[PDB]
Amino acid sequence: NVGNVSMYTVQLGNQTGMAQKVFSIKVDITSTPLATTLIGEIASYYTHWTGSLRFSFMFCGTANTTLKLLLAYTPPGIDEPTTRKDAMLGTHVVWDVGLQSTISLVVPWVSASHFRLTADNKYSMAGYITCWYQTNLVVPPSTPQTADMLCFVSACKDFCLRMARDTDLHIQSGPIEQ
Amino acid sequence: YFNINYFKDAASSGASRLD
Amino acid sequence: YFNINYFKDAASSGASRLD
Amino acid sequence: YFNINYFKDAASSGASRLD
Amino acid sequence: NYIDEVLNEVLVVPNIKESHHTTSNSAPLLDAAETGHTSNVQPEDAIETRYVITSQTRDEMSIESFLGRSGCVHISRIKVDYTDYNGQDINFTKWKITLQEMAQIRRKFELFTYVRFDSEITLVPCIAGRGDDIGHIVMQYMYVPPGAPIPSKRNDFSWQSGTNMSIFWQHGQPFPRFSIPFLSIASAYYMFYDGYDGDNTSSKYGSVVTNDMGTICSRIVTEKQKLSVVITTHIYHKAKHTKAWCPRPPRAVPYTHSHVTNYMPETGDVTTAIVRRNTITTA
Amino acid sequence: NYIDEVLNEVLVVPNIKESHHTTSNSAPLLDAAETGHTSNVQPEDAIETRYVITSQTRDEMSIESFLGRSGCVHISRIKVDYTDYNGQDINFTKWKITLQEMAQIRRKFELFTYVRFDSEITLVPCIAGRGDDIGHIVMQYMYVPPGAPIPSKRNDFSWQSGTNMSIFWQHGQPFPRFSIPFLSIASAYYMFYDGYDGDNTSSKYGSVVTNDMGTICSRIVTEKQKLSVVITTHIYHKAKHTKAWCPRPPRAVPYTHSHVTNYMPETGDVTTAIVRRNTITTA
Amino acid sequence: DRIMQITRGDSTISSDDVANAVVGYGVWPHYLTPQDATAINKPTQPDTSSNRFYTLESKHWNGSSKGWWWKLPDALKDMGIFGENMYYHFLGRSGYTVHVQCNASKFHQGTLLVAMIPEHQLASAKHGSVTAGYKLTHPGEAGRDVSQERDASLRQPSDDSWLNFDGTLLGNLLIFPHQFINLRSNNSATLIVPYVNAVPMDSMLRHNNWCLVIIPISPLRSETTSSNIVPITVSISPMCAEFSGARAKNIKQ
Amino acid sequence: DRIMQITRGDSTISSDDVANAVVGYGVWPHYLTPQDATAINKPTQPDTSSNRFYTLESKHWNGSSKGWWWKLPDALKDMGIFGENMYYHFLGRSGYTVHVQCNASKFHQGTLLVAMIPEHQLASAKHGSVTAGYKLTHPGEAGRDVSQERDASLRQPSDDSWLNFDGTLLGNLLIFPHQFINLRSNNSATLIVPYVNAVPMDSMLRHNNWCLVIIPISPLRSETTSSNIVPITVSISPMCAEFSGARAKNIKQ
Ligand SMILES: OC[C@H]1O[C@@](CO)(O[C@H]2O[C@H](CO)[C@@H](O)[C@H](O)[C@H]2O)[C@@H](O)[C@@H]1O
Ligand SMILES: OC[C@H]1O[C@@](CO)(O[C@H]2O[C@H](CO)[C@@H](O)[C@H](O)[C@H]2O)[C@@H](O)[C@@H]1O
Numbered sequence A: 001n002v003g004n005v006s007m008y009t010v011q012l013g014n015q016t017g018m019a020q021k022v023f024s025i026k027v028d029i030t031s032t033p034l035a036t037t038l039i040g041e042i043a044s045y046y047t048h049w050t051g052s053l054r055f056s057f058m059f060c061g062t063a064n065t066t067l068k069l070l071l072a073y074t075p076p077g078i079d080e081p082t083t084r085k086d087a088m089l090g091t092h093v094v095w096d097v098g099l100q101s102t103i104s105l106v107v108p109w110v111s112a113s114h115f116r117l118t119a120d121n122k123y124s125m126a127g128y129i130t131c132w133y134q135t136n137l138v139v140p141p142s143t144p145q146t147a148d149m150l151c152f153v154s155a156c157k158d159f160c161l162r163m164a165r166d167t168d169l170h171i172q173s174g175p176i177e178q
Numbered sequence B, C, D: 001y002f003n004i005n006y007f008k009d010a011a012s013s014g015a016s017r018l019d
Numbered sequence E, F: 001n002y003i004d005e006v007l008n009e010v011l012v013v014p015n016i017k018e019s020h021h022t023t024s025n026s027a028p029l030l031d032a033a034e035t036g037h038t039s040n041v042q043p044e045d046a047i048e049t050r051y052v053i054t055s056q057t058r059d060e061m062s063i064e065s066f067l068g069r070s071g072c073v074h075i076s077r078i079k080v081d082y083t084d085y086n087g088q089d090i091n092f093t094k095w096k097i098t099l100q101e102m103a104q105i106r107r108k109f110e111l112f113t114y115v116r117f118d119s120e121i122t123l124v125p126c127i128a129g130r131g132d133d134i135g136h137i138v139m140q141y142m143y144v145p146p147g148a149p150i151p152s153k154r155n156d157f158s159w160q161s162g163t164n165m166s167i168f169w170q171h172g173q174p175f176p177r178f179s180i181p182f183l184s185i186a187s188a189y190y191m192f193y194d195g196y197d198g199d200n201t202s203s204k205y206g207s208v209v210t211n212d213m214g215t216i217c218s219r220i221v222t223e224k225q226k227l228s229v230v231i232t233t234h235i236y237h238k239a240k241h242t243k244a245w246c247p248r249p250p251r252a253v254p255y256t257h258s259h260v261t262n263y264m265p266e267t268g269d270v271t272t273a274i275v276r277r278n279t280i281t282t283a
Numbered sequence G, H: 001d002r003i004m005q006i007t008r009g010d011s012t013i014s015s016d017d018v019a020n021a022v023v024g025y026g027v028w029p030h031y032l033t034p035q036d037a038t039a040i041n042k043p044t045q046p047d048t049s050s051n052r053f054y055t056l057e058s059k060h061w062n063g064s065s066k067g068w069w070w071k072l073p074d075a076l077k078d079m080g081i082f083g084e085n086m087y088y089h090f091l092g093r094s095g096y097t098v099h100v101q102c103n104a105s106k107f108h109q110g111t112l113l114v115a116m117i118p119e120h121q122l123a124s125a126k127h128g129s130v131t132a133g134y135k136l137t138h139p140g141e142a143g144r145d146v147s148q149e150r151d152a153s154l155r156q157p158s159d160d161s162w163l164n165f166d167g168t169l170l171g172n173l174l175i176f177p178h179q180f181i182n183l184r185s186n187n188s189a190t191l192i193v194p195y196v197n198a199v200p201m202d203s204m205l206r207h208n209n210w211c212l213v214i215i216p217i218s219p220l221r222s223e224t225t226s227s228n229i230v231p232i233t234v235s236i237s238p239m240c241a242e243f244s245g246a247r248a249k250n251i252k253q
Helices: A084-088 E002-006 E063-067 E103-109 F002-006 F063-067 F103-109
Strands: A009-012 A021-026 A046-050 A053-059 A066-074 A091-096 A102-107 A128-138 A147-155 A160-164 E022-024 E071-079 E093-096 E112-129 E139-144 E165-169 E177-180 E215-219 E229-247 F071-079 F093-096 F112-129 F139-144 F165-169 F177-180 F215-219 F229-247 G004-007 G011-015 G067-071 G089-101 G111-118 G144-146 G178-182 G188-193 G210-218 G231-236 G239-246 H004-007 H012-015 H067-071 H089-101 H111-118 H144-146 H178-182 H188-193 H210-218 H231-236 H239-246
Touching: A009 A021, A053 A066, A066 A084, A066 A102, A084 A128, A091 A102, A091 G089, A128 G231, E063 E103, E063 E229, E071 E093, E071 E103, E071 E215, E112 E165, E139 E229, E215 E229, F063 F103, F063 F229, F071 F093, F071 F103, F071 F215, F112 F165, F139 F229, F215 F229, G011 G089, G089 G111, G089 G210, G111 G188, G178 G188, G210 G231, H012 H089, H089 H111, H089 H210, H111 H188, H178 H188, H210 H231
Parallel strands: A091 G011
Antiparallel strands: A009 A147, A021 A128, A046 A160, A053 A102, A053 A147, A066 A091, A066 A128, E022 G004, E071 E229, E093 E215, E112 E177, E112 E229, E139 E165, E139 E215, F071 F229, F093 F215, F112 F177, F112 F229, F139 F165, F139 F215, G004 G011, G067 G144, G067 G210, G089 G188, G089 G231, G089 G239, G111 G178, G111 G210, H004 H012, H067 H144, H067 H210, H089 H188, H089 H231, H089 H239, H111 H178, H111 H210
């Protein structure tokens, strides 16, 4: 998927079971999949980061289609949750897919140290965010039953960086010619 | 200590300011 | 002679004072 | 910073002015 | 100003107010990102926030502290010769100025479409002794603006610099450094370009068509010495009094060649920083 | 201020007043130290004192003259090689910053739980001639903040410092010196810690979990020389604009290793400064 | 406008479609007053960490579904913090917010009646004077009925719907705070409810004040693949929780 | 006057005899300020139900006793409410009150040195760079040492007292907030202590801010029947507890 575009879409499926899980990523903004992102790509130019962050999701589904996902931010402290109940217990947002289309999930800033390191560090572990089905994806007749959701991340006015340093995400195992 | 553009030209000066 | 923080940043300065 | 003809003689001075 | 500038508290970020619950109609968390705009949602909106008076400056997040940092952009080298001194194209270097002969820094700009600034060039000559004594090796770094006699070889007539700039550095005396005005016939330096030389199906197309700023020619004035040497004069560059227009997505593919975008590696599959996951389900 | 500051009479100690005898009830000499507090008894209380106007300042007894003194905290070494230049992990040093790689100074802080300050680093490179002529040996000291390309070897791409700090020193020109802001995500530098990496019964526990400030990488830019050398660039450190919280009992056991308290010597019985007496009766 | 936004903890819920919201007996839930009070100790009031948006176990809406209930003081006997404070204290008092989500498409047809009920003394399925058992009116996130099977040895309630489980023609049930979920207009149902009880603070364990019922009135009818499952998900938020009468800790059951 | 009375929860402690009380660094424990703060969520502050007078496991004072310590953020990893809120939240912050009771008669002779210590990084008993293990600096009500025996396979701390376990001549330990229990005047020891740490709220699990030590200085000496046991009992009270960064729940260990 990765070398292609798809590498960007997340198809919301069938799900025979119920209350099943979609995906997860970890918040440490310098961690693929995050990293490469206009933000990540950047942050990797500084040693320390801080503030809240914003995750936005969009339904590239259908019109007649319907769904309800539950997204959650599991602060640093434990393990990325295996189950929904366990994750619903912390910070989250139920998302009702409808005429709108975009739900934006905020990632409050929870930390001990006013500031976190941009570099992988067990200490400065920001946590995980995950998504699960609240209900389902119901589609009336003759509509596809899988559809995609795009996801994004922009900053919050909270946000701020410091201690400039040279990037991670780019090794010029060159040189460069003429 | 500052604003003492010891040199004539403007191209020569410290990192600008912020505003 | 003093208080002439020839440098911009504060981290760069003499040993502080006493009070 | 300027007009500080550190040297006595006039022949010694910066590039003149413009007017 | 001082305090604010010395304490570096010029650009401060707002604080996070206190919130209460909302069992109300308007849902700020819902917007349609298709509008191409960006959401405006905050902590205070989504949760029951507290009250934190902030104190983080976005000072270091300024195109001047992002850009205004010296970077190797060229490493002039001279493996002297004493056998043939002078001769054609020897013992004197000539480089055509550009910020993209070195990833690192090239990278950094490229983050924007257009840029403008006064540049400060710092020369770090390093004299490697390949002999039993290096003597007194004087040096001349001449700047040759476009359309000018570029030394054919070591002692042309162009090293008289009757009207050119030549900085001189003699072993011991410190690193030479000098500032230069924004040099472009254009209001800004074209970090990119979607133009060509002409209609000639063989014309040039890129950031080159546009920026041809001249060259820098190095010479080692001193004459013939006994014990050999090799000089390596490093060229660092800093952007002071910079402006930038229309940001761009950073680069993720190791380039090759300058004044071009071309990535297509020699055989190797195009590689990028993205890492692979077993499953989306666990991070 | 001046006089008081030039004459160094800022913090002066009280004088010893005059006393007379006391055939009275309240006995100041009697207190119960179990309260954990400290007695408050003085000369004037216990004896028939006179009158001495003092003139001793407690200026030099300030966390800034106690701390604010430069100390060797590291001795970067480079036994050059000309055989293989570059190669992996050579002719370039990389050190992870810390005040406890050297007793002396480590000692001194450790006197307090928490500390904070701006640091001034002074570099004392010393070039030992193992050859018949050392030439011109330029140098590059780059500071690599956490999570950054640390040179694999001598000429990476990281020595371009397009956005990093690299100080350059060339034989003759004086000692390089530069100040640095308090670097911690925390309000203070953790001189100690009673925390761990995690619940992993294999997690880290100490003053390390917390302070990982990056590294300093040394390079000798000049290229290949003829006659060998060995460089020893000493790293001194001074604390300017310091604060300290919650004092601790000094250390009496020679440590081993850093970021740890561990004393337990290799076999030898744990030794301390206390001396042995034959008898308490005679000193 | 129908869209609604609700924020309770560190949690928020959205709904791009709705049928207003309802406040039980037109009273908004709040904290106890030194007038109506009785106890003497200072109540612990976990704010946010407790009165937040907990979501239960989901359920299937069948053409054979008959109805399912959850008893509130009880549904969160496990929901972190609230549900611990419950067990550590004798007196507990709190109000709730009920977000009932159940979507499908505009090509579906169905109707759910949602209602809360003060003191919902259920009836046993068996004739006599034997009252329903504890352990069965104390299901938990999971709720009860569905249309399930069970031991008749257990002093088991009435799985009987039309009688309201209490033996009152369902349909008069509209007297209790309620709303429906008519899949053709609706998406959810939102009930908000204060603390109703002849006592200022009751036993969070022995007594369940609020009882919630959801009953399929007009049976779900699509023309789709029965691969299309249309769950029903309940989310709840203690509000103005207040506790007191601290001590050891009860025990799970 | 020596008598003292202290009231913290639903709990109170008395002492007909005492050596004043001590406030660590002369600062009284209180709640976090929106200035020094950093987090963004509204902290849960269990009042009373949490910051109350918990008493630990008691201990014996031997003529062979050597000393025993308890690490605070940790000693109450089980103490109801506080010790749950600990596990449910990432950030925890709180100050304490330490009531150390140890009586015997006026015909007894003994001396206990009690002290609290900010960041008490212990040393391992074994030479090297191996730091003490988690699981052993996380004893619980029970505390550590006594004068006990154990696996040397465990990255085990120094059971070593005179060096302070950190390798600082005990006796300079008097620099940390302290007091003694001289059985001839004293009865208890009372330490009160604010929240000290370079961060506004730390991890109640990974980091123990306060560490408490009690060390027999002058050995217990009676002339009675060794049927006469003179325990040492520790009681503690979180004060101005504040928590935040709510979520699932960690796990016991
Ligand atoms: O000649 C340098 C090379 O970089 C560009 C960006 O593509 O921009 C400039 O920056 C330089 C700094 O060293 C100036 O010297 C320069 O001459 C200027 O254009 C290019 O246009 C140029 O080809
Ligand atoms: O990295 C140095 C080492 O010492 C500590 C004290 O334990 O504190 C600091 O002092 C330094 C001065 O050289 C700073 O460079 C430093 O990075 C800082 O922490 C440690 O935390 C650190 O491990």
